[PDB]
Design a binder for this molecule. Structure first.
Ligand SMILES: Nc1ncnc2c1ncn2[C@@H]1O[C@H](COP(=O)(O)OP(=O)(O)O)[C@@H](O)[C@H]1O
Ligand SMILES: [Zn+2]
Ligand SMILES: [Zn+2]
Lengths: 179, 138, 167, 379
């Protein structure tokens, strides 16, 4: 709201360990294969399944409530297996959002309730708008905005994304405290 | 940029045309002392690239190829980057289930090299008219 | 009131309620919401369910007319059927060889055939039988297109047999 | 020298590409998606303030020169195709945008009718331009446009879109998907122009003269009991997903008739050729009649060229045109590119002529000095 990030008070129940905060409400079925190296946030009722995964997330990663990050299955003639996805640094997944994406780049703002397709690659410094469908096996270049049910080039982003996005994710993390 | 409403508080530019824009969009000019907008500044062309198969093409090759990638294709029904599927290759979309078999294009033995667009029907008549007017203009 | 079948890798951690009738070779993913409110949920072999998938038989909650005498409305589902991420479903009869896409809201009385796909993030409340081997794409408009051949998804289901153990 | 770019700014669609090519590279709706506005504003709009028009054209030309075409604007020349009697302030603005902001080397303001003639190769021909706003005709005799014998009527795309909307609202039958299986009239107060255009193209067609003449008298109902031909089957069209509009068979073949209707004045798209040709010089009559050209996207409508040429030969026998244009042989030219992209193709053929282009075209150095674009009005 007018550049400034607003207050969000968390409850007592949340798994805070080595900077990484993960809501107890949010199930993450397969805790072994999933890894959170940095000071990540995972909001309540969110899913990070371990269906033969290697879900590596960023330094300041944010996943809002009711949102799912599942790896896609690669339809290979040699052997059909689930491809391990790698969420980049400073990644912001918005609320109620579906992600079946392989290799999500750093410094990205994925919009609200937007379905990303199977085996979908996202390069760094991009932005997917809200109520948008990226089809299976699609690529989005840097400094781009993809939107619509087709999921196609809408326009370009501001030049200063790399520097700006840092402030957003770090401010949200700092502003997001217990009550 | 969008999550925080950068499109609220705006900075003004000095010159002929006055514009109200967010600081995120604006650029500072160091040669002189006056910040200028994306509108005010002149735009150039550096490099061309495909959004699917990210391959930096030179300016000369683009003019020959009509600003297009040879390997990658976009579906006609919906506007999305197609994918090569085998059984010996057919072109299919992920969003809509439009195939290359539907319109009746034959499957190619080689993956990329085989696929092509038919020649323009009035291409021979075109060159004859240019050469006539070229001689007449001379 | 549960009719669990061997071979089917239904995960215990997924939520189930009512007079369920489980299929031979079905594979239910965790946090998959199946309810048998009025009539039973009949499941065909190879009918895998992925992520959030609201399958209810609550026509008594939807309308509540107090008509059709008993009105069991038993939820029949076919074989080799992929339920994707966040797709709402409520179909009394549903055919074999059909794949609803992610966040696809299927209607209160919509009958699915073979080789038929619902569009991702597309909602269809209107009651209308789907033609044989035709796909719907987009939310803004339906834009129906007839497919050349039906698409099978057997290999995917078969591999989950190996994964689900110790999860 | 570099291959000069060709742009053709229209109300419905803009043609864009490079000179010495078989057809245009990009053809797109002439609109811009501004932040806040739900429906995108139209870039060409006649009779508005210059500053507001300048901003829209600046926004549009930017999209053409970077997103659609990939080339530096300052490097290579421009060939701006625009119809004769295009509003003064609009053409003055369009040039001022290209010369001031983009800093193009030189613009050439070619009339669309003379460009359409080059594509065929014939030196003299009659040219009808059935566009979006107005269906204009202008006789071109051996390179010289005859402004004296001009002709225009508002029987284009806009007039046809409006006529379709009116007819659909009368016989309105939509299946919303909310106990709307029964015929529901005018659930939506207005239908968006994007939908109406798609219905027109796919559903509606141009009827034969014999069947059309019956349709005219049928809807009139001039002391006759159900004297209409059997219509085509009713086509169901989806509106915004769930809502299914059942289009009546009568609407498909009646909507077009407003173009070819006499309406007492004796002013149709057909009559406009013969009205112009009768006003032409006596020597030029037989050459122009023999060489007819039908450009514009409105004439792409299926079975338009047959109805027009037939309606011509019927209106010839009418006593007004029977004296002058009685024993004349009307023959249509088939241009190399499609009816929509005939105008553009001429500018490309002209753009390929680097030697003549530089001389005829107005240089930026001249515009910066003078500030006076040459027009067919007095200097
Ligand atoms: N391929 C086509 N088939 C049928 N109708 C068309 C086609 N292309 C355009 N049209 C219709 O005819 C009109 C042609 O207008 P156009 O000549 O492109 O614009 P302008 O007259 O402003 O240059 C469009 O508005 C559209 O309604
Ligand atoms: Zn490519
Ligand atoms: Zn497609």
């Amino acid at each position: 709201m007018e550049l400034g990030e607003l207050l969000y008070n968390k409850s007592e129940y949340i798994e805070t360990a080595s900077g990484n905060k993960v809501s107890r409400q949010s199930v993450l079925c397969g805790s072994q294969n999933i890894v959170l190296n940095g000071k990540t946030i995972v909001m309540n009722d969110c899913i990070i399944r371990g269906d033969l995964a290697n879900v590596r997330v960023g330094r300041h990663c944010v996943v809002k409530s009711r949102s799912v990050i599942r790896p896609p299955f690669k339809k290979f003639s040699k052997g059909v297996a689930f491809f391990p996805l790698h969420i980049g640094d400073h990644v912001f997944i918005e609320e109620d959002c579906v992600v079946n994406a392989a290799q999500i780049g750093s410094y990205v703002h994925v919009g609200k309730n937007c379905v990303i397709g199977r085996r979908c690659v996202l390069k760094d410094c991009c932005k997917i708008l809200d109520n948008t469908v990226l089809p299976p096996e699609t690529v989005v270049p840097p400094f781009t905005v993809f939107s619509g049910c087709p999921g196609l080039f809408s326009g370009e982003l501001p030049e200063c994304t790399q520097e700006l996005m840092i402030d957003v994710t770090k401010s949200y993390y700092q502003k997001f405290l217990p009550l | 940029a969008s999550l925080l409403q950068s499109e609220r508080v705006l900075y003004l530019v000095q010159g002929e045309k006055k514009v109200r824009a967010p600081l995120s969009q604006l650029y500072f000019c160091r040669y002189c002392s006056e910040l200028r907008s994306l509108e005010c500044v002149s735009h150039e062309v550096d490099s061309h690239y495909c959004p699917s198969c990210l391959e930096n093409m030179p300016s000369a090759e683009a003019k020959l190829k009509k600003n297009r990638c040879a390997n990658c294709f976009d579906c006609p029904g919906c506007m999305h980057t197609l994918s090569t599927r085998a059984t010996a290759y057919y072109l299919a979309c992920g969003f809509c289930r439009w195939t290359s078999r539907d319109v009746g294009m034959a499957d190619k033995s080689v993956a990329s090299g085989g696929w092509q667009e038919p020649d323009h029907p009035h291409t021979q008549r075109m060159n004859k008219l240019i050469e006539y007017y070229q001689q007449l203009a001379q | 009131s549960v009719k669990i079948a061997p071979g089917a890798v239904v995960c215990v951690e997924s939520e189930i309620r009512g007079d369920v009738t489980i299929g031979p070779r079905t594979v239910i993913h965790p946090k998959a919401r199946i309810i048998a409110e009025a009539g039973p949920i009949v499941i065909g072999e190879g009918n895998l369910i992925e992520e959030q998938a609201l399958i209810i038989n609550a026509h008594p909650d939807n309308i509540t007319p107090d008509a059709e005498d008993s009105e069991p409305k038993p939820m029949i589902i076919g074989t080799n059927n992929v339920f994707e991420v966040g797709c709402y479903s409520q179909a009394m009869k549903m055919g074999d060889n059909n794949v609803i896409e992610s966040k696809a809201y299927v209607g209160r009385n919509v009958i699915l055939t073979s080789g038929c796909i619902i569009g991702a993030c597309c909602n269809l409340n209107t009651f209308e039988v789907i033609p044989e081997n035709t796909v719907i794409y987009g939310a803004d408009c339906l834009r129906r297109v007839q497919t050349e051949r039906p698409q099978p998804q057997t290999l995917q289901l078969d591999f989950l047999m190996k994964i689900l153990p110790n999860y | 020298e570099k291959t000069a770019v060709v742009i053709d700014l229209g109300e419905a669609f803009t043609k864009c590409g490079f000179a010495g090519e078989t057809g245009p590279r990009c053809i797109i709706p002439s609109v811009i998606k501004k932040a806040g506005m739900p429906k995108p504003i139209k870039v060409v709009q006649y009779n508005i303030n210059t500053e507001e028009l300048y901003s829209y054209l600046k926004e549009f030309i930017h999209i053409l020169y970077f997103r659609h075409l990939l080339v530096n604007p300052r490097d290579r020349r421009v060939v701006v195709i625009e119809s004769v009697l295009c509003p003064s302030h609009f053409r003055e603005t369009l040039t001022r945008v290209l010369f001031k902001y983009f800093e193009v080397p030189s613009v050439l303001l070619a009339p669309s009718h003379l460009m359409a003639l080059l594509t065929l190769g014939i030196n003299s021909a009659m040219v009808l331009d059935c566009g979006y706003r107005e269906s204009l005709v202008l006789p071109i005799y051996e390179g010289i446009p005859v402004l004296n014998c001009w002709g225009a009527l508002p029987l284009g795309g806009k007039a046809l879109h409006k006529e379709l909307e009116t007819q659909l609202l009368e016989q309105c039958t939509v299946d919303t998907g909310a106990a709307k299986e029964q015929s529901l009239p005018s659930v939506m107060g207005s239908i968006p122009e994007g939908v109406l255009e798609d219905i027109k193209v796919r559903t509606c067609f141009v009827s034969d003269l014999t069947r059309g003449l019956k349709i005219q008298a049928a809807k009139f109902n001039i002391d006759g009991n159900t004297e209409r031909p059997s219509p085509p089957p009713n086509v169901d069209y989806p509106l915004d997903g769930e809502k299914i509009l059942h289009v009546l068979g009568s609407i498909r073949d009646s909507v077009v008739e407003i173009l070819f209707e006499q309406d007492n004045e004796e002013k149709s798209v057909a009559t406009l050729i013969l009205d112009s040709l009768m006003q032409c010089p006596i020597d030029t009559r037989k050459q122009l009649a023999e060489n007819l050209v039908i450009i514009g996207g409105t004439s792409m409508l299926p079975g338009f060229l047959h109805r027009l040429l037939a309606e011509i030969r019927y209106l010839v026998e009418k006593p007004k045109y029977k004296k002058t244009l009685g024993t004349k042989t009307f023959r249509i030219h088939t241009p190399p590119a499609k009816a929509n992209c005939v105008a553009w193709l001429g500018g490309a053929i002209f753009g390929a002529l680097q030697d003549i282009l530089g001389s005829r075209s107005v240089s930026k150095e001249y515009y910066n000095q003078t500030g006076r674009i040459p027009d067919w009005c007095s200097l």
